[PDB]
Subunit: 451 residues, 4 copies
């Protein structure tokens, strides 16, 4: 209830006239213009407040209104605004060292701005690495259907969500896909000996059938998040890594969403006992206060780029990547996550959120499955629990809308896989409290009563 | 003390060698320069050496270093709202989009991205989807010039005409075509001819006809090919290319990543050439590179095609960080600075002075083939022979770049663009550069030229 | 003429080595066999050695060698009209098209090509143009099975799932997808499951969903994967795949290049499996390989889409030699032979006898993993271990192939199809083969098996 | 002979069952060939036509050759099939004979069609480099307005968009350059070849794409189907020298120009070059039976002789090198040689060219008349000054008028949009002076319409 009422009309009119909004139907009258935020709550220009159950876009991990983060950026901006990453600056050096600690070592870090750029960089490094190790023929990249890895032509090629690809094709050749592990739609795969699991055998078979010698890397999120919070058997990622190694290919762990405490570990891959050859990161690295991403590469791979030959080094320049202010802010963000025990709070609040959700709506006739790890949770809505038929779009959409009216931002896997945008997503900021979790669940439960 | 400074430097260099992967350079850990601080046109490393940055970082620190008002703008926004998804909106993005539309001359709708490469990728996707929704799904092809650069991603590398930026990252997608670049130095007299009799202008029309008009989505070009060597076209070239695009039903995308925001002596490069582009891409100088931000400006009529109620009719593209609140608020202040300090006109005037003085000072040098530029954007083409125009040996131009750096000038070079044509020195100093600093640039270069 | 004949053969072999490039083999001039003459199921080389041809040349001499009536048919036509372009027509092409339509069961329109690879290429182009003219230009994708083969050209190799036929000829075009091949030996009990619960059947539907139905033009498959290893599917597999194509709006192409013309005990392989394919491709046995000819049969509803007055509406494709008059006239006589000598039914009955006798004869051999087939089309899968099904060592299966040839039997092998899986012996004898010649085949193989 | 009722039935069967290449669905317009002799063909209704196109640039020795029929028949009675993984005597003898014809020293891979022959050349080029330490060389370069086949890869290499449209997308790695055309680029034939812009373009594009990524440049010596587009004399040699400079191969597409068509055994022989790879089809058998060949320099073949798993050419073409077609081809080459057909092509071709200029050269819509050997293009224009291609109906009416009057003349239809304006003649090499008079007389009268 602001003392002076903000002038919305001009701002709203200007947005509609000049701003192109990603991922949505033209509905200017539905635009939410964010004004301010604190903790887990955001507020629009009209003054309405919402619990942000999505951390913006899976990314505001340390929460909103962090004065410490603002100061870190401010101090750096006053010292040195820019230095090219062909050369170096102290914030980038300190962050690279810090990321190496977080990763468990030993990696060399190339800085980029976005998760899409980080994945593109991983592809180029993989190809040049093999060209310089006497295996020029290895160019192929393999991923899972229903996955996402970016918004560029090559990361869309690697993406398995056709609703993100359609009408932007044709793409380059050399991108292959396999069935995604999903313990809900493939019941009992979790029980099986991992190497008897069909979608695990598929990885090995396709690599054999494509010829090992042509495969550069397998890319995967530890959990398929955007796609629907699809989860694999415990030994899946390790089996995939052993398969890559068998065929001489690299494993790239896409940690763009799972990174920085999201799943209850520093990174998603750490749930699954693997050391990936390349790790890509963005989003939570700065809690999205400033743009920054990174591609961490095993050091043996970096060694291949040290020669005196004309084309032996990485011939790639990213103007803004590794921005000084973003790096300084990221260092402070990592210190916050560590000092406030946000990784373990994610694990614990995540369990509570999962346990409570099942208790509150699990019996609902259109709730097919509730699953998650850390503060990363999917509620799969179905027309029928027996057949697992995805719920009608109209029904899930009305639940997301109802929650917003009531002050809760909840996500949905819209525009990922046709006929399967049936999944509600929660990824709240890691600082979320037990009481705010009660608000989330209470709000959702009430919204569920409309279907 | 120096001894302490030496120790800190070593510790830092050691950490860098161990942990940091540097773009665009041979692995030379000892040679690395760690930036420490900066003010105006000068940067300083951790050991305390100062350099005139004749490159504005990477063609991008247009308003100069040390801008406290830019730091304040970002800080004030970070304290108000640090993040909001661009699927939704926030005031800094809205105000910047409106401001950019003024700068562009209207009427455009702006999609925000982090980098120039992302901005170009966005342009490609918008061009393809626009045609798909206008009844022409078959239009997928993108056309650009050899010796051009448009980004570091698979698709922007496919559109790129610098093979040294592409080699060993192929194969790329099909549907990317290239034509001869206009270069008034290596194609003497093209500037004089009627534009439509110019062979590389006829090439654009011919190739569109021979590929079938109906398959061409867009032609992408920088108004000046900058990274490639500051290659410059006849005055009427860009307008003839636009008219040719329109004839074939294709869009023209002006890549303003480097030429934007006063660099050429106009707000944008295309404004030198009397054309209104369908799409404009921007990055770099938009924030003077203090924070990452880029934009893809699209004509209103193209945007209208994405307003339908159909399932796939909207732009199904999400960029997490693009349009960052702090970067937008900082960009707004940056544009205010450029306007209030008359930096666009200073670029034009200091640019002329730099060009005229360079010619007087080193024009007669036997290995200087050509000096050209527009605004604070200048290339000095070095040759073994002025008659044949044979590019100078790599060692010779490299020694000049290194000699300047020792003498405290950072000058650029078109390294790793086109094989055997790495022979062009580049200057793009910050638009605040003074007459006296220009004298330092030229004096230092002149002295470094004496070693070859 | 003891040394005169030797001089002649030596000379011929020397000229082969210097001038002839052979398909699909390591350079082995001594190894080369020069065919001289043939009759029935037996071929004879220039040195005078005779062999039972257990492979019908290359799966193709279905009616057997030495057919004077086929020679006469070609000769009579060469004397009447040697050539006429298929943009226009000739009577042999018209009569053959009509006869192929009967054999197919109607109602199809036939486009003539020389090879199976060309026939499949033609099918791809027709599928794409069909959808472009049906208001779905976005449909470009082609789907097939890993371990499958569809030709030796860039696009048919892209559709091919045998990497040893592809390696070092890449990169290929995008838009070619592959799924797991049904193989009732390595996936035991899929033949007794409900077809829609079979994982590699569900895979077809899932991948079409995940790629977006609207982008899929066609699924291409042989009814039995022949060159690959005689891999066989559950009875209802092909019908399920067709229903899945129809569900997604895509076409089904039956690759009948090897299975066609009696090979499997039906006129065509798809007829074992109760489907009416949208497109059928044929070559090989159509002329018993006496002359080159192939065909792409397309459903009439599909051909209707190419009858418009629009500029690009017709099939803009010309194949100079395809539908050669002599080859068509010979093919007609060949079809008449197959029908009059009841070669289809004979293939089915002789094929059963061959399969059962092989099981009785070498079934218990410790390295014989599986014996399977349908009609005169049989695979013997050799393994190091019957429990693990590990493919046998290459040197071991190679020695069996060589031992057989030395004793006058040509037996095939799935060499250079799938790495690590080159372990399957293949028999496809001419459909005229007799009980007694089958005894010779099996007896010779049994004796060759002894040595491993 | 065949009563109207029976011909109607045959025509009806064609409509129902036969899919024709390269034409609008016009069942009534279909010509069903019945028989032929020399340069004349006859349809089922009994009408006769001078075939000014040799079928499709291919019936080089003429129709009605009993000796060719006998050669095929004799072989079909001896051995009808043997796999080219192995060998037969007709293939061996032909390979040797083709090597003589080419000038040596080449190794021959047999295919059926020109499209397959070109595909084979692409695969060999790529594997050759992969085995020579340059796996990065995968690109193929060709000219816009050129044609190399009807398959996805040969269409990618093709520069005629009307043969490509709606069959796309194609694979990446196919590049195109401006075609030399001495009519639309006047005075390039007088320039020093290396100052010619479309010659410089080859060198520049190879540099700009990076030499190390280029596998081969493919080109017809004369762009025939595209509209008989002809280059300066030193163009092909300059292109070869440029390929060599960049470490790339030159493939001469001789599918149409081969076997006497241009007045030499092969087109490249007009231009003083020895190509790395030569592809052939059409006239090799005079189109009596299907056969094509890919001739590869000996030194390229040497790279495929190793003991490594993947070192040999892993390519099988079932029908390629058919015994009857090879035996017939051998007799066809003996005929061309014995009857002095290559020389006749040059002589009759010169005659045809000069008489045409005299008869129709002054026609206001005839922009240019050009050719070499029995390969001639007459470019029709709305205006001789601007060279604007003639209206489409106008050239179509001339083609139709000629057929009505018993002459089959060709046209470059469905090649380059807006540029379908060139009439083509490629008559059988045995054509006589008197038949040439008939051709020209018939065309002259047809031109009267427009
Ligand atoms: Cl600064
Ligand atoms: Cl994934
Ligand atoms: Cl905030
Ligand atoms: Cl450009
Ligand atoms: Cl198959
Ligand atoms: Cl004839
Ligand atoms: Cl025979
Ligand atoms: Cl050509």
């Amino acid at each position: 209830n602001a003392m002076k009422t903000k002038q919305t009309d001009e701002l709203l009119a200007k947005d509609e006239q000049y701003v192109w909004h990603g991922m949505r139907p033209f509905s200017p009258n539905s635009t939410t213009v964010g004004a301010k935020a604190e903790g887990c709550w955001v507020e629009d220009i009209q003054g309405k407040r919402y619990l942000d159950g999505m951390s913006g876009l899976w990314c505001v991990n340390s929460g909103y209104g962090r004065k410490e983060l603002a100061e870190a950026a401010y101090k750096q901006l006053q010292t040195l605004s820019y230095f090219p990453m062909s050369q170096s600056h102290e914030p980038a050096i300190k962050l690279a060292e810090k990321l190496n600690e977080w990763l468990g070592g030993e990696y060399v870090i190339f800085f980029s701005n976005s998760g899409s750029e980080a994945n593109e960089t991983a592809f180029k490094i993989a190809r040049q690495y093999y060209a310089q190790k006497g295996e020029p023929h290895r160019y192929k990249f393999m991923s899972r259907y229903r996955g996402y890895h970016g918004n560029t032509m090559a990361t869309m090629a690697a993406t398995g969500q056709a609703q993100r690809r359609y009408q932007y094709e044709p793409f380059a050749s050399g991108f292959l896909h396999v069935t995604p592990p999903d313990c809900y739609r493939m019941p009992g795969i979790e029980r099986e000996n991992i190497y008897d699991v069909e979608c695990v055998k598929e990885v090995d078979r396709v690599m054999t059938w494509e010829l090992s010698e042509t495969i550069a890397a397998f890319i995967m999120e530890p959990i398929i998040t955007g796609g629907g919070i699809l989860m694999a058997p415990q030994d899946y990622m390790k089996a995939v890594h052993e398969t890559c190694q068998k065929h001489g290919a690299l494993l790239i762990s896409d940690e763009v969403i799972c990174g920085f405490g999201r799943t209850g570990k520093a990174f998603g891959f750490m749930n699954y006992d693997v050391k990936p050859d390349i790790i890509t990161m963005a989003k939570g690295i700065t809690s999205a206060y400033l743009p920054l991403s990174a591609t961490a590469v095993k050091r043996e791979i970096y060694e291949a780029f040290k020669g005196k030959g004309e084309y032996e080094f990485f011939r790639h320049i990213n103007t803004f990547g590794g921005n000084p202010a973003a790096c300084a802010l990221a260092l402070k963000n990592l210190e916050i996550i560590e000092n406030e025990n946000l990784i373990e709070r994610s694990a614990q609040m995540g369990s509570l959120l999962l346990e409570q959700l099942k208790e509150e709506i699990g019996e609902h006739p259109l709730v097919g499955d509730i699953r998650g790890k850390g503060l990363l949770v999917g509620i799969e809505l179905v027309n029928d629990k027996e057949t697992k038929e995805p719920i009608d779009n109209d029904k899930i959409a009305s639940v997301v809308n109802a929650c917003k009216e009531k002050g809760l931002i909840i996500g949905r896997n819209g525009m990922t896989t046709a006929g399967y945008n049936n999944i509600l997503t929660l990824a709240p900021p890691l600082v979320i409290s037990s009481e705010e979790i009660a608000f989330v669940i209470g709000t959702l439960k009430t919204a569920m009563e409309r279907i």
